[PDB]
Design an enzyme around this catalytic site. Structure first.
Site, PDB file in Angstrom:
ATOM      1  N   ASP A 185      10.223   0.938  93.201  1.00 46.86           N
ATOM      2  CA  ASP A 185      10.741  -0.237  92.452  1.00 46.86           C
ATOM      3  C   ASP A 185      12.095  -0.621  93.045  1.00 46.86           C
ATOM      4  O   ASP A 185      12.353  -1.768  93.344  1.00 46.86           O
ATOM      5  CB  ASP A 185      10.916   0.135  90.976  1.00 46.86           C
ATOM      6  CG  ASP A 185       9.541   0.288  90.321  1.00 46.86           C
ATOM      7  OD1 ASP A 185       8.555   0.048  90.998  1.00 46.86           O
ATOM      8  OD2 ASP A 185       9.498   0.647  89.155  1.00 46.86           O
ATOM      9  N   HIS A 189      28.359   2.795  91.741  1.00 46.74           N
ATOM     10  CA  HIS A 189      28.562   1.364  91.401  1.00 46.74           C
ATOM     11  C   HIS A 189      27.229   0.630  91.547  1.00 46.74           C
ATOM     12  O   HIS A 189      26.743   0.013  90.618  1.00 46.74           O
ATOM     13  CB  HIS A 189      29.587   0.744  92.352  1.00 46.74           C
ATOM     14  CG  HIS A 189      29.910  -0.651  91.891  1.00 46.74           C
ATOM     15  ND1 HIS A 189      31.044  -0.940  91.149  1.00 46.74           N
ATOM     16  CD2 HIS A 189      29.251  -1.847  92.048  1.00 46.74           C
ATOM     17  CE1 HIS A 189      31.035  -2.260  90.890  1.00 46.74           C
ATOM     18  NE2 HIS A 189      29.964  -2.861  91.415  1.00 46.74           N
ATOM     19  N   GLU A 190      26.631   0.699  92.707  1.00 50.67           N
ATOM     20  CA  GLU A 190      25.324   0.014  92.920  1.00 50.67           C
ATOM     21  C   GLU A 190      24.257   0.685  92.057  1.00 50.67           C
ATOM     22  O   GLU A 190      23.173   0.165  91.881  1.00 50.67           O
ATOM     23  CB  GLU A 190      24.941   0.110  94.397  1.00 50.67           C
ATOM     24  CG  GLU A 190      25.982  -0.632  95.237  1.00 50.67           C
ATOM     25  CD  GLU A 190      26.128  -2.064  94.719  1.00 50.67           C
ATOM     26  OE1 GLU A 190      25.201  -2.544  94.087  1.00 50.67           O
ATOM     27  OE2 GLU A 190      27.168  -2.655  94.960  1.00 50.67           O
ATOM     28  N   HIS A 229      24.559  -1.672  88.953  1.00 52.63           N
ATOM     29  CA  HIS A 229      24.060  -3.057  89.182  1.00 52.63           C
ATOM     30  C   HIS A 229      22.535  -3.038  89.278  1.00 52.63           C
ATOM     31  O   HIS A 229      21.856  -3.811  88.632  1.00 52.63           O
ATOM     32  CB  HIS A 229      24.636  -3.592  90.491  1.00 52.63           C
ATOM     33  CG  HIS A 229      25.872  -4.398  90.208  1.00 52.63           C
ATOM     34  ND1 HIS A 229      25.830  -5.764  89.979  1.00 52.63           N
ATOM     35  CD2 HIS A 229      27.198  -4.048  90.136  1.00 52.63           C
ATOM     36  CE1 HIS A 229      27.094  -6.184  89.786  1.00 52.63           C
ATOM     37  NE2 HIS A 229      27.969  -5.177  89.872  1.00 52.63           N
ATOM     38  N   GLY A 256      13.415  -7.005  93.168  1.00 53.53           N
ATOM     39  CA  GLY A 256      14.359  -6.598  92.088  1.00 53.53           C
ATOM     40  C   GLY A 256      14.536  -5.080  92.087  1.00 53.53           C
ATOM     41  O   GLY A 256      13.631  -4.345  91.748  1.00 53.53           O
ATOM     42  N   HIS A 281      29.490  -7.200  85.990  1.00 52.55           N
ATOM     43  CA  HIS A 281      30.953  -7.015  85.798  1.00 52.55           C
ATOM     44  C   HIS A 281      31.356  -7.570  84.429  1.00 52.55           C
ATOM     45  O   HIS A 281      30.900  -8.617  84.015  1.00 52.55           O
ATOM     46  CB  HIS A 281      31.706  -7.746  86.910  1.00 52.55           C
ATOM     47  CG  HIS A 281      31.321  -7.145  88.233  1.00 52.55           C
ATOM     48  ND1 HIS A 281      31.974  -7.464  89.413  1.00 52.55           N
ATOM     49  CD2 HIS A 281      30.352  -6.234  88.575  1.00 52.55           C
ATOM     50  CE1 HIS A 281      31.393  -6.759  90.400  1.00 52.55           C
ATOM     51  NE2 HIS A 281      30.397  -5.995  89.944  1.00 52.55           N
ATOM     52  N   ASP A 321      26.661  -1.894 106.900  1.00 56.98           N
ATOM     53  CA  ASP A 321      26.196  -1.150 108.101  1.00 56.98           C
ATOM     54  C   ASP A 321      27.391  -0.490 108.792  1.00 56.98           C
ATOM     55  O   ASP A 321      27.615   0.695 108.653  1.00 56.98           O
ATOM     56  CB  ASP A 321      25.489  -2.112 109.063  1.00 56.98           C
ATOM     57  CG  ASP A 321      24.574  -1.318 110.003  1.00 56.98           C
ATOM     58  OD1 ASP A 321      23.464  -1.012 109.601  1.00 56.98           O
ATOM     59  OD2 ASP A 321      25.001  -1.033 111.111  1.00 56.98           O
TER      60      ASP A 321
HETATM   61  C1  LIG Z   1      32.425   7.515  89.030  1.00 52.77           C
HETATM   62  C2  LIG Z   1      33.052   6.916  87.788  1.00 52.77           C
HETATM   63  C3  LIG Z   1      34.343   6.171  88.101  1.00 52.77           C
HETATM   64  C4  LIG Z   1      34.105   4.679  88.276  1.00 52.77           C
HETATM   65  C5  LIG Z   1      35.344   3.968  88.804  1.00 52.77           C
HETATM   66  C6  LIG Z   1      35.005   2.706  89.553  1.00 52.77           C
HETATM   67  C7  LIG Z   1      35.439   1.427  89.055  1.00 52.77           C
HETATM   68  C8  LIG Z   1      35.133   0.225  89.772  1.00 52.77           C
HETATM   69  C9  LIG Z   1      34.389   0.292  91.000  1.00 52.77           C
HETATM   70  C10 LIG Z   1      34.081  -0.936  91.785  1.00 52.77           C
HETATM   71  O1  LIG Z   1      34.576  -1.992  91.412  1.00 52.77           O
HETATM   72  N1  LIG Z   1      33.241  -0.754  92.888  1.00 52.77           N
HETATM   73  C11 LIG Z   1      32.776  -1.732  93.823  1.00 52.77           C
HETATM   74  C12 LIG Z   1      33.209  -3.106  93.655  1.00 52.77           C
HETATM   75  C13 LIG Z   1      32.756  -4.136  94.542  1.00 52.77           C
HETATM   76  C14 LIG Z   1      31.864  -3.814  95.615  1.00 52.77           C
HETATM   77  S1  LIG Z   1      31.273  -5.113  96.675  1.00 52.77           S
HETATM   78  O2  LIG Z   1      32.425  -5.568  97.414  1.00 52.77           O
HETATM   79  O3  LIG Z   1      30.100  -4.656  97.399  1.00 52.77           O
HETATM   80  N2  LIG Z   1      30.791  -6.378  95.646  1.00 52.77           N
HETATM   81  C15 LIG Z   1      31.799  -7.288  95.026  1.00 52.77           C
HETATM   82  C16 LIG Z   1      32.562  -8.172  96.027  1.00 52.77           C
HETATM   83  N3  LIG Z   1      33.374  -9.296  95.540  1.00 52.77           N
HETATM   84  C17 LIG Z   1      34.354  -8.957  94.463  1.00 52.77           C
HETATM   85  C18 LIG Z   1      33.819  -9.062  93.008  1.00 52.77           C
HETATM   86  O4  LIG Z   1      32.383  -9.262  92.967  1.00 52.77           O
HETATM   87  C19 LIG Z   1      31.940 -10.426  93.713  1.00 52.77           C
HETATM   88  C20 LIG Z   1      32.538 -10.473  95.144  1.00 52.77           C
HETATM   89  C21 LIG Z   1      29.346  -6.610  95.295  1.00 52.77           C
HETATM   90  C22 LIG Z   1      28.978  -6.106  93.889  1.00 52.77           C
HETATM   91  O5  LIG Z   1      29.294  -6.648  92.831  1.00 52.77           O
HETATM   92  N4  LIG Z   1      28.232  -4.941  93.903  1.00 52.77           N
HETATM   93  O6  LIG Z   1      27.873  -4.444  92.628  1.00 52.77           O
HETATM   94  C23 LIG Z   1      28.873  -8.094  95.490  1.00 52.77           C
HETATM   95  C24 LIG Z   1      29.438  -8.747  96.747  1.00 52.77           C
HETATM   96  C25 LIG Z   1      27.347  -8.185  95.522  1.00 52.77           C
HETATM   97  C26 LIG Z   1      31.427  -2.462  95.802  1.00 52.77           C
HETATM   98  C27 LIG Z   1      31.883  -1.427  94.909  1.00 52.77           C
HETATM   99  C28 LIG Z   1      33.949   1.563  91.503  1.00 52.77           C
HETATM  100  C29 LIG Z   1      34.257   2.765  90.782  1.00 52.77           C
HETATM  101 CA   LIG Z   2      13.680  -3.648  94.188  1.00 60.29          CA
HETATM  102 ZN   LIG Z   3      29.554  -4.981  91.524  1.00 58.02          ZN
END
Ligand SMILES: CCCCCc1ccc(C(=O)Nc2ccc(S(=O)(=O)N(CCN3CCOCC3)[C@@H](C(=O)NO)C(C)C)cc2)cc1
Ligand SMILES: [Ca+2]
Ligand SMILES: [Zn+2]
Ligand SMILES: [Ca+2]
Ligand SMILES: [Zn+2]
Length: 163
Positions: free
Chosen positions: A60, A120-121, A124, A94, A130, A101
């Site tokens: 999935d 984090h991922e 999501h 999904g 957020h 990379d």
């Molecule tokens: C372990 C427990 C502790 C947790 C602490 C804790 C707290 C906060 C975070 C945190 O913020 N991590 C994070 C934020 C942004 C991106 S990222 O650059 O790929 N990114 C955002 C990039 N940018 C800024 C805002 O969003 C839109 C544009 C992508 C996204 O949302 N992915 O989900 C998107 C681009 C798809 C990756 C990781 C981590 C740990």
């Molecule tokens: Ca999928």
């Molecule tokens: Zn995010």
């Protein structure tokens, strides 16, 4: 059927299946394997979710990289900035997450830590988005885990989304 839905049956059921499309070299292969299992427990520790890894019947949620091309809306970037992402909840598309990379993720003293970038991922891939809270996990700011700290903000969103 509860009510009408947008065609995509939002993911919402115990027993989940996931399969990485290609481990990363920056860290041990068996290590990326652990950074994901730990992460699995990092989010499963807040709910009785059952994760199942496969390798033949597709999954999935599909993990991999972002590549330079792709097509999304931001090809290549290196450096921190975009670190990874996933598509809304759904079948096949999904549940897939893309990791940067050209970067250096490792379970050692690297900096992004496959367990952290994935965590984090790992939120999501579900549905929560957020919430503006900076001290949250879905917050719009990358915060390394110098002490791995959770947050009810997720326990709550994941509580109504699962238990
Ligand atoms: C372990 C427990 C502790 C947790 C602490 C804790 C707290 C906060 C975070 C945190 O913020 N991590 C994070 C934020 C942004 C991106 S990222 O650059 O790929 N990114 C955002 C990039 N940018 C800024 C805002 O969003 C839109 C544009 C992508 C996204 O949302 N992915 O989900 C998107 C681009 C798809 C990756 C990781 C981590 C740990
Ligand atoms: Ca999928
Ligand atoms: Zn995010
Ligand atoms: Ca990057
Ligand atoms: Zn993508």
């Amino acid at each position: 059927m509860y009510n009408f839905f947008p065609r995509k049956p939002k993911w919402d059921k115990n027993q989940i299946t996931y399969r990485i499309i290609g481990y990363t070299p920056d860290l041990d292969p068996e290590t990326v394997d652990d950074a994901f299992a730990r992460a699995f427990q990092v989010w499963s520790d807040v709910t009785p979710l059952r994760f199942s890894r496969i390798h033949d019947g597709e999954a999935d949620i599909m993990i991999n990289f972002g590549r330079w091309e792709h097509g999304d809306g931001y090809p290549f970037d290196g450096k921190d900035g975009l670190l990874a992402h996933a598509f809304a909840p759904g079948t096949g598309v999904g549940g897939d997450s893309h990791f940067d990379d050209d970067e250096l993720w490792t379970n050692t003293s690297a900096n992004y830590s496959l367990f952290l970038v994935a965590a984090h991922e790992f939120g999501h891939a579900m549905g929560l988005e957020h919430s503006q809270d900076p001290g949250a996990l879905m917050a719009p700011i990358y915060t390394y885990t110098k002490n791995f700290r959770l947050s009810q903000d997720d326990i709550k969103g994941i509580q109504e989304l699962y238990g």
